[PDB]
RNA sequence: UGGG
């Protein structure tokens, strides 16, 4: 335990205090999981290639009876690896093999085929592959794609907030949104009528859209309403009783029931009389006539004598109609309830809005009402109805639409057809009215349970589907006139829409951009990101208010801390450490089951809807040995709230406390002691850190750095470890142990470490061996460390000794002062790498050769150039020196003696060729690293291109011969065994070459078996390794693909060193970013009683205002951190015995209460104690978890172990006057960071640059020499001062005056200092732009 | 950070900078007429900056009214020094004379030889020295540092230039050979025209106006689409048909070339000559040789019944006169007889001009 | 502005002219042809939409390009900039001699002075440098003095010291609100890549030092130096014209 | 092209004082009409004026 | 994407 083979070198101290149930996962897995979902064979139809294949296929031409049947698919092996394909600048992809067969139906026969043709498929498209590090390599780029955040398809009931007409009326609408196709919306107007909006068109009533569903008015009222039974016959005039349906009522007359009084006139409507009359059983009783005039007939009743009828529905009656309907002979007439308390009259007004009760008519008004164009032909109405409404291809809800659709309606089935049925939208309408009736709740938009994310797999599947349908459109047309086509699955498929669709999506998009190469943490947080943008998207500006606010469902899924500030606030987010994604695309978070009074160790992942109903315990809570709670009242959360609950009322447990913080902010110790916004800045500034020469371990830390560094994929992870054989800077090999081995071929592990290589930000990356020799390796090891990594631990910055005071007022506001010692020690130094390219192209005048130095240039620049005009490796190029020369011929020379005389003295070219060359720009100084030049097939390479081929061939042969050497090593071992078995000549047997001629015949069995088998193995391994070496050599040298117009490409790399300077722009992880005002010498820095000056000094003024207590705690805990290491170092200066050092180390690690760290000495025997001591000589890596920290008692005790003053303050003396400062001073060690922002590129100071051809103004860009900008508020200010000439020179002469330039400059050279203003050209531009219009403007004399 | 469509904007190209001599004269402290005379001088400066017109033509073109040549001459010599080591003055002597005046003003054997070599006998000493070594009185290799110093003396101007217009062909039309057939596959093909029509079709139904705009927005757009997609498809089909006709009709790999009347290639597709000959003007061809769909359509009767036009003859004639003259024949008629021995029926009178043409040293190589 | 990669590039507003002239030549060629009235009415409508789309892009047909889509631009949007005067005129000009560096703060350089980087120098003052090089007789031709500046001889540093001594240089920040955001100070050459600003004046800029950049301008001629020295000197004006309570007060 | 946008003749000469079809190159010829077209000599800054 |  607690080994890992790295950790035995250096131990971290953890304060613990709470256990961790589950380990941190791979944490990139979900990303790869998406890729793992895109490529696989799924018979069930899961999202991937098979879903699009079964979606588009089978395909058939119209009335041609020809079908195509696709069967599965297959993927081939890439032509290159990651390294070589990244170096050559070629995209990294894989071939696509998807088989399909052609079937020709029989002519003029039912359900028959004359012949079927199954042949091999044609090569189409290229599908890239996601690297093990999680990047998509295209054109030599990292190209990390960010996941998308959007709303899930389904039904959304919205209250809209109820403010529309200002009259204070609530309006409940709803939106059914499918996955693809037209969106359907239902809305209420203040008129209290139902209206329908289809694809944001004009508002139409809900009756005209339902009328096309073949529901008659009687079926509409009978289906969508509950009619009360009423019958008036023989003057009785009685109705049925509705005690439960009728609550409140107004009685205008006495109501008696079965001869007994029931409700008196003006009687109380309270539940007393309702229950009194409800207890007794009363049949239908008579009522007065006045109650009928308020009722409305539901169904359509006709007289039995004659055929005519009265209207349809939604029409009241009169006292004169009772004679007609009573004389007609109708015994019973069903009428709707006509009672408004919770319910109310609806849909009646909508019936009154439109005349059309019929499918044909309503189809006409919906057709012509939608499309402004050609009126309906009665074909277009049905074609747009069936095509735009539910259909197989156009309308698909699939799993999210059907699942959320059935869940919103409380339906039992979780699946169904991909299209809506007739009763589905009717149910949406019934519940939709039920929301207005007062029953039900309004779903929130910001609620995450309805908010779904997508990944690269589903989007790439969508684009591949769009391309495959785009081809499917063209395939159907060629099958009609094709008749019999030999080898049909060959030329009938074009790969241009496929490779162009997927190559266009991966190549260019707003969700696919360059990965940040600075630090591994910026890579991890770059690969894990949430964005509301994308194809459905939320673009910007709009929809940005409530949505940006924090919602309680964001607790254990997205980190509230990390987010950019000004533009993107509330949009970009970061997932939690333990957060994962469901198969359906929903985020869940784990919990810990609690049964009875004990807490079970099993975990259960819950979603928002699942966790909302149950109760989850608070993060920090005590525990017992059996798992019982110490306190009865436990803080918990039920629904959207928090409060105390009983020990038996809590369902689950929060497990770890870090579930609410992402990986970037998980490296901030004592997060509770810093402000929320300042920690938001601290997590942002730590991602911009630039790596340096040597990474120093942080004294104050967390312990998440290990999983971040090993899971970032930057370092070298050792697989199937074993005894190390050979080590080296660029190569490390390991001999695998015999325990885990694959039978046959033997072989050992080889590792090629990545040397200095250009970045996207121009920085450098490197790897160095962490092991020496003769030590084993366990699986899951770290062989090398990438940039800003130390022994597998992630150190992205360098510690310093902080002193808090002002020093002679040199620190002002947030600024900082640095000692010269930091500059002398080389700390805070970075290296950049710049790529330079020169192209040679074939023009109209013929090819452009690169050779024969440069014309019209002295030998000064020619001495540095050779090998066809390229610089040597290791040369230092400064200034405007030409790195690569080039000659472009010009053949326009004709005749006259001046040409012959010009060619007499000089000859050769005689100035017929231009001097254009690479021409390295100024402001760049450094040496050369690598020559990347690419050449063309059959262009007769020559030059130096053969040297790199000899290097690659020598390397491939050198590292290739090792495995073979092992092959005949073991082979000669076995042959040695069989020759020693009998007739052993001892050393003489090894002295004779060629296996001593196979030891003659020896025994007969070995002569017919062992000898021929041994020679067969020798010839097989020999010729096999020679064949593989020849194929590899043929693989090294290959013609590089390039454009038909380009001839040859030259690329050379440069390196530049950058040292710390007053430009500064440093930062901490607590949100503190200063600048360097002055660099003081060591003599001027304050020193303690021992004479040790402080390295860095900060201003305390920012501590109370910015509310950062983690800084000071980091300084004191840094003192207690380094003091112990100084004790071990002081003990090692005297070469103390292993016993005393063992007692001091063991006494050092076991301190503190609890901390649940059981690591202890008296285990490692002899050495490895002195190794870890020599490792911790510099300092002790104390690790502090995020939400579990240390305390003042632990800091003071651990500090008193180092004999340091408990108050954390030490006396200091002045470095100049030497006087003692009044009051003590807090000293410490804080972790310091450098930022990519430097004054090297931020200084310009333009004098006279190039001018634009339009408006005669300078440009704005640096390098191309921008003149910055002079704005409107500046003219406002200069008008506030009242200076006419100071602004007058800047408005005209310095900008828009053509003659003011030359004449002004001429007056300045002579020293006249005369203005002589002139007329601006931009005003003339405005003049002409107005003159183009019919408006005339003219100056006056 | 891609900013959607990207800048894609007019941009106001800032390069220009053909001649800065105007900005140089603008800073020269002239009085009154010297500025106008200087502007008259700088206008006649050639792009090469070696020999510019005639000194008398300037003065005759000034509209003198006195202002004799003694002034404008001092303006010449005056600007030539402020020039980048020199400009114009022609004569081919004044360039090297001014370049050596302010360069050094000392070294071993600079001015002593430079004055006589620059003054006279230069053109006589350009080919070889020989007897001139006895005229200059120098002994053996003493002049090696002199002429060696002149070699570095060097077109006098053309230092600034700054002409980014390199004029590249790029793609255009391509052909390929394989499986025993060197047949072009029309190896361009953006497909944008094809793609745009397909893509634009989606665009027509995307107005989202509610005005329908069936009369103007819908029919006109459709017409434009038919009009541009049909025109691009017809142009691409004509270019592919002409590229295939010229491909199959003549083979580049085979030695020599076959003359094609404009009519034979026009008679293959049965199209008028002007239509195809106009298509072959600005359209080039890219194969794995050289770098035009115009030089491969050269027509000539070759003036013989036994065989090809002039391209084959011209290449052959330069391949003949290339290696020849072991001694110093310096002969064109002998090349016309050797060419006549193959049955080409060369006149041998106009043969030299053809042979001489296009950088050939003949007949001045004698 | 033809590009070598894209051959001849055409502006979005250029196609409107060839479109209106195209439909105009169609209407004129088809007019005298003596054709039915429906076709010539359709031609009048197409030309009407063409001219109306040329003058005003917004509303109406809002014609869309095939390749780049977008509404493109018409004369109404091409007036100036944003369809204001702001971008290319009315204080939209970039002038010259501007800023672009970081600001620092020393506890020296009296309140009328500011540290000017010596590398930031030698460039803004090039006209003065050439003037004094031609005045003192150390050179003759302008190109010779240009080579002397490019070779940065030690004498050029002394002459530059003579130039910068009393020559004022005015400072301004990027989001200037009140008038005190832009002032005029006396430069003093300092060794470094940044500018040292007086601390007490920083409160007038309402900024802090995180490494913020700045804007710098150099007045030319003469009267501009008198308007900078007599007005924008922070030693000349203290009381802010808002409260009347003093500013630059230490903190 | 003649009679077109930014055409020669009207709107001014394209390059320096040169004229079409190689006539009246520079300098002493100012007021004049070219043989083939109405091209005249100008500083070429008139492109904005016309 | 990022800085005030």
Residue numbers in the entry:
A (entry chain C): 1 to 1341
B (entry chain M): 104 to 257, 259 to 291, 293 to 396, 398 to 413, 415 to 473
C (entry chain D): 253 to 503
D (entry chain D): 52 to 101
Excerpt from the publication:
Gene transcription is a fundamental cellular process carried out by the multi-subunit RNA polymerase (RNAP), which is conserved from bacteria to humans (Cramer, 2002, Werner, 2008). The σ54, which controls stress related genes including those involved in nitrogen fixation, nutrient starvation, infection, and other cellular stresses, forms a class of its own (Buck et al., 2000, Merrick, 1993). σ54 recruits RNAP to its promoter sites via binding to the −12 and −24 consensus promoter sequences and forms a stable RPc that rarely spontaneously isomerizes to RPo. Instead, it requires ATPase activators bound remotely upstream of RPc to convert to RPo (Buck et al., 2000). In order to understand how transcription is initiated and how initial de novo synthesis is carried out, we prepared samples to capture the RPo and the RPitc state by binding σ54 R336A to a promoter (−35 to +28) with a pre-opened transcription bubble (mismatch between −10 and −1 by mutating the non-template [NT] strand) to form RPo and then adding UpG di-nucleotide as well as GTP, to allow de novo synthesis of a −1 UpGGG +3 RNA to form RPitc.
Where nucleotides were added to RPo, we obtained a structure at 3.7 Å of the initial de novo synthesizing complex (RPitc), which has density for the whole transcription bubble, the newly synthesized RNA, as well as dsDNA both upstream and downstream of the transcription bubble. In the RPitc, the transcription bubble has extended to 15 nt, in agreement with two additional nucleotides being added to the initiating −1+1 UpG di-nucleotide. T strand now is pushed further back into the channel and is stabilized by β R1269, K1262, and β′ R346. The T strand is in an expanded conformation compared to RPo. The β′ coiled-coil loop is now positioned in-between the T strand, RNA and σ54 RII. The downstream dsDNA is stabilized by residues from β′ switch 1 region (1325–1328), β′ clamp (residues 207–212), β′ trigger loop/helix (1145–1150), and β′ jaw domain (residues 1170–1175). We see clear density for the 4 nt RNA that base pair to the T strand. Our structure reveals that the RNA is in a post-translocation position, and the trigger loop is accordingly in an open conformation with a shorter trigger loop helix (Vassylyev et al., 2007, Wang et al., 2006). Interestingly, we observe density corresponding to σ54 RII.3 close to T strand and the newly synthesized RNA. The structure here is consistent with a role for RII.3 in stabilizing and guiding RNA toward its exit channel.
